[PDB]
Amino acid sequence: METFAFQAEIAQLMSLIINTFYSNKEIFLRELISNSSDALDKIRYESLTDPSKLDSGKELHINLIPNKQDRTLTIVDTGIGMTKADLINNLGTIAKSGTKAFMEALQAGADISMIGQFGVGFYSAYLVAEKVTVITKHNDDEQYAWESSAGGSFTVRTDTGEPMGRGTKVILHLKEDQTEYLEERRIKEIVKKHSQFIGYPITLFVE
Numbered sequence: 542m543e544t545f546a547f548q549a550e551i552a553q554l555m556s557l558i559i560n561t562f563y564s565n566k567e568i569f570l571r572e573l574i575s576n577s578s579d580a581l582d583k584i585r586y587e588s589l590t591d592p593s594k595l596d597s598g599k600e601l602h603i604n605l606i607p608n609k610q611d612r613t614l615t616i617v618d619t620g621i622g623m624t625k626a627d628l629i630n631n632l633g634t635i636a637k638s639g640t641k642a643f644m645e646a647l648q649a650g651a652d653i654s655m656i657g658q659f660g661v662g663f664y665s666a667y668l669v670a671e672k673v674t675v676i677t678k679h680n681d682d683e684q685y686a687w688e689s690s691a692g693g694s695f696t697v698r699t700d701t702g703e704p705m706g707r708g709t710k711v712i713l714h715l716k717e718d719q720t721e722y723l724e725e726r727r728i729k730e731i732v733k734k735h736s737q738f739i740g741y742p743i744t745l746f747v748e
């Protein structure tokens with residue numbers, strides 16, 4: 542396991558998301574499903590020129606997996622995934638410019654729900670999660686686990702878990718008062734409200 546320090550802009554945004562009083566927390570799911578949809582668009586587009594991009598899996602889908610025993614809500618996709626370079630470096634650049642633009646917009650009257658317009662909607666996961674584990678597999682790299690409970694640092698390690706083939710799993714270790722997001726009725730309500738027209742099958746798993 543390797544440990545990395547977040548740059549100051551991202552660190553401040555993670556603190557804002559964790560600490561600000563904001564009741565409309567459900568938007569996190571729309572954001573993560575929308576990120577999953579974009580990653581699926583990317584692998585599908587690549588496959589149009591190179592069909593072998595799908596040798597790691599032809600199915601293009603989004604799975605919503607709650608687990609009451611573990612208190613986790615996992616968003617799984619068979620999208621493009623992320624390489625180690627994406628996880629440590631490329632996404633750190635996106636997170637910096639995106640945070641600066643979002644922090645700017647917030648001072649200019651914008652709402653926390655507009656986070657996705659700034660390329661950092663992934664961070665809305667901290668509205669409901671005390672820890673986020675991202676398991677990912679990109680065609681050009683190995684399976685990795687990125688993780689952060691904020692506090693200024695994140696970890697990256699080669700993942701020994703079940704081989705995914707290709708894609709990303711966003712594991713939300715829910716805060717104790719956010720367990721409503723493990724309830725079938727609640728997840729169904731949110732998906733219907735914000736994600737009804739996503740162009741991939743979304744399966745809401747049950748227990």
Ligand SMILES: NC(=O)CCC(=O)N[C@@H]1c2ccccc2-c2c(-c3nc4ccncc4[nH]3)cccc21
Binds near residue numbers: 620675
């Ligand atoms: N389903 C998908 O494939 C969506 C992918 C996704 O949401 N990716 C998100 C994402 C989106 C926008 C910005 C950063 C990141 C990020 C990071 C990340 N933040 C960083 C900050 C500083 N340094 C390095 C960093 N790496 C790590 C795992 C997953 C993601």
